[PDB]
Every structure is written in C-alpha cells, then in structure tokens.
Amino acid sequence: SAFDLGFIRGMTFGFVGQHGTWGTDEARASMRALAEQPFNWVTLAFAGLMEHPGDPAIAYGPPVTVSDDEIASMAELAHALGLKVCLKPTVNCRDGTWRGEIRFEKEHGPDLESWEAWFGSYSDMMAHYAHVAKRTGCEMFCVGCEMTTAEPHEAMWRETIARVRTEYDGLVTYNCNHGREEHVRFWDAVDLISSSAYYPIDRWRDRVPVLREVAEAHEKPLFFMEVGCPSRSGSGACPWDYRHPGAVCLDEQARFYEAMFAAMPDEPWFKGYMLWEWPWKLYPREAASEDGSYCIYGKPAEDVVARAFSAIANR
Ligand SMILES: OC[C@H]1CNC[C@@H](O)[C@@H]1O[C@@H]1O[C@H](CO)[C@@H](O)[C@H](O)[C@@H]1O
C-alpha cells in the first residue's frame, strides 16, 4: 500500500541527464554528497528530446541521454548509500518549449503529426525505462511530468500506464504541474498523486486545503515530486522560473523553504517532498554564496531543510 510509504525526504539528481555525465567521477562524488544530507530518497531525472513541440518523434538513449548503464550505475550507488530511488524519464524540446505546451493539430494517425503518434513514441520511451527501473530495483517510477496539454488524452495516458505496469512492479506516480492536481482525471491509475509544487511564497497557506481535498477525494496519498526555488532575488514569487533575471540571493531561497514547511500540515494524506534539484557536477561549498541555482548545498536553505527533515526522521 502507498499509504504505508515512509514520509519522503528526497532530492532530484542529475537533470537533464546528458549522455556520459553520470558516468563521471564528478557525478559519483555529487551523489555521495547528496546521501550525506538527511534524505531517504533520490530521483534520477533525465530528458529525451523532441525536435519541436509539434513533432511526435522523441530522441532518447545515447547519444542524447545517459545510457542505461549510466542509469544502473547511479541507481546502484544510491542503493549502496541507503537511498530509495525513483526513476523519472521525461521529454524536453530542443527549441526550449516547455513540455506542458506540446500540441498536435491532429488527434489520430501513427504517420501524421498526431497525439496518437506522439503517445506511441512516449509510451515506447516509458516502457523501456520502466523495464530499466525494474532491472535496477528502483522503488518508484514517474510516468510523466508537467504534461498539461497531454493530460486530457486520458485513454492514451491509461494505455501508457498499463504498458508500464507490465514492465514494472514498484510504485508508480504521475507528476502534474502546480494547479493541475484537481484537474487530472487518471489519478486512479497510479499509486501516488504528485505535483510540481512551485507555489509562490504567499500562495502556500491558501493552496493546502485543495491539496488535502484532492488526496481525500481520490483516496490516494499526495506528495511533491518537484519542489524548490532558485537562490535569486525575487524568485520566491515565481519559484518555477529557472531563468529569472535577478542577482544571487541565498535568503530568498531560504524564505521559500520556510513558507512551505510552515504551510504543510502533519496529516496522513501528505507523503512529503522530492526537492528540485541537485547537479551531477556539484560546486564546492565555498562557491555556494555565488550560486543562483535550485541547489540548496552550502546555502542557508540546506539548514532549513536539514532541521526540518531531521526533525521528521528523529520523530
Ligand atoms: O524550473 C524548475 C523546473 C520546473 N519543472 C520542470 C523542469 O524542467 C524545471 O527545471 C529546469 O529544467 C531545465 C531543463 O528543462 C534546466 O535547464 C534548468 O536548469 C532546470 O533544471
């Protein structure tokens, strides 16, 4: 039962998972550092590529992504360090279009620029990596991330998930974007509801009640498969924006984490936090004060999180 899952104190690693990058000594060192934090989970996240948001072809595997061996190598390392592992393949667009906005002028037809064709490629990709997750003992598999335009294609999502279930016996989640939790119609097909909970600092309190209602309505636990904030000025107001025009501001990131932890209640429907994110090439701690990324390492947010996560664990 998903209801039995230990509360998640997690971190996403390695995105976007470019070929060869996880096979490095730098990546192994970065994973060792991640496991020294009070985390019980890591998510191995990487992205295949679509040429454009209206092209149904998806390039995955070498030379674009980390190899299956690289995946296995990082999973084995994480497991040897006592972490549970979620595998999260997703898709990006080479022109930089958000995957939540992919669009096809046609619905059906495998050889056409259609949703049917796109789901064919996507499902091939997910089926392959579900098998990898099974062969490498990954405790969770994430079947999608922020696919807002794809979500209404419910029958096709259910087809995708059914195929994943034949290839993989562990926990399955789908990760919707913030504000989509109540709109997704196939939560029954997965084990855990999850979201990219990039809520601005001032929105947390008002949003919790809907999160509770979604979990209770669907009789499923809910967690955050992504949550985080860049350490840049003003970023707390738009935590999802990774190219925010502002100077480094460590305290802003720490303010995001305080607001989130202050808002979330200690209730059974809520299963925790998969933080965004940790790089395969980790900067020295000294260099932290100069870093504007989502990474919390070496920053005041590291302590806010440690304090919060250590309190949870040692309870
Ligand atoms: O802005 C933070 C997240 C929100 N959810 C999806 C994810 O893609 C996004 O991360 C950025 O991802 C891009 C690549 O798609 C990467 O260039 C950035 O450095 C962030 O990791």
Q: Which residues contact 94 (CB under 8 A, 6 or more apart)?
A: 49, 50, 51, 52
**Alpha helices (runs of H) in 110-186, residue ranges in sequence order:** 115-135, 154-167
Q: Report d(CA 106, CA 153) in Å as an integer.
A: 12
CATH number of the CATH domain containing 3: 3.20.20.80
Amino acid of residue 161: I
List the one residue out of 190, 195, 202, 205 whose CA is nearest residue 271.
Answer: 195
Q: How far apart are CA 189 and CA 198, in angstroms?
A: 24
98 lines ligand 1 (CB under 6 A): no
CA 198, CA 178: separation in Å to the nearest integer? 6
What atom in ligand 1 is closest to the CA of residue 226? 5
Residue in the structure block whose two tokens are 């392959």: 128
Question: How far is residue 37's CA from residue 15's CA, in Å, rounded to a whole number?
Answer: 19
9 CA to centre of ligand 1 in angstroms: 20
Give the residue, out of 15, 46, 99, 199, with the most ligand 1 atoms within 8 A of its beta carbon, to mutate for a pocket test. 15
How many whole angstroms from 303 Cα to the centroid of ligand 1? 23
Residue 136 structure tokens: 């490498």
Residue nearest atom 3 of ligand 1, based on CA coordinates: 240
Evaluate whether 98 touches 50 at the Cβ level (below 8 Å).
no
Alpha-carbon separation of residue 112 from 117, 186, 224 (angstroms): 7, 26, 35
Question: Phi/psi at 270 (nearest 5 deg)?
Answer: -95, 120
> What residues pair up with 140 in beta bridges, in sequence order?
86, 171
Contact 39, 83 (CB under 8 A): yes
User: Do residues 313 and 41 make contact, with C-beta atoms less than 8 angstroms apart?
Assistant: no
Q: How far is the CA of 24 from the centre of ligand 1 (A)?
A: 22
Backbone angles phi, psi at 288, to 5 degrees: -60, -45
Ligand 1 within 6 A of CB of 92: yes
252 CB under 6 A from ligand 1? no
Peptide bond into 277 cis (omega under 30): yes
Amino acid at 301: A
The protein residue whose alpha carbon is closest to atom 21 in ligand 1 is 15
219 alpha carbon – ligand 1 mean position (Å) = 30
Report d(CA 122, CA 41) in Å as an integer: 26
As for how many domains the chain has, the answer is 1
Distance CA 235, CA 292 (A): 10
**Range of the structural domain that residue 296 is part of:** 1-315
Is residue 25 within a helix (H) or strand (E), and if so which, with residue range? Answer: helix 25-35
Residue 274 Cβ inside 6 Å of ligand 1? The answer reads no
If you ran DSSP here, which 8-state letter would residue 189 be given?
G
15 lines ligand 1 (CB under 6 A): yes
Cα–Cα distance between 160 and 158 in angstroms, integer? 5
| Solved using | X-ray
18: which DSSP letter? B
Nearest-atom number in ligand 1 for the CA of 196 is 5
Ligand 1 contact via 277 beta carbon (within 6 Å): yes
Ligand 1 atom 14: the closest Cα is on which residue? 16
Q: Please state, in angstroms and as integers, the Cα–Cα distance from residue 102 to each residue in 19, 98, 226, following that order.
A: 24, 7, 20
Ligand 1, pocket-test mutation among 242, 244, 253, 295, most atoms within 8 A of CB = 242
β-pairing verdict for 8-13 and 270-278: parallel
Q: What is the resolution of this structure in A?
A: 1.6
What residues contact residue 47 under an 8 Å CB cut-off, 6+ apart? 15, 16, 17, 65, 89, 90, 91, 92
User: CB of 43 within 8 A of CB of 86?
Assistant: yes
Pocket lining: 242 vs ligand 1, CB cutoff 6 Å: yes
Rounded Cα–Cα distance for residues 105 and 118 (Å): 12
Using a 6 Å cutoff on CB, does residue 280 contact ligand 1? Answer: no
Please answer whether residues 33 and 282 qualify as being in contact, where contact means their C-beta atoms are separated by less than 8 angstroms. Answer: yes
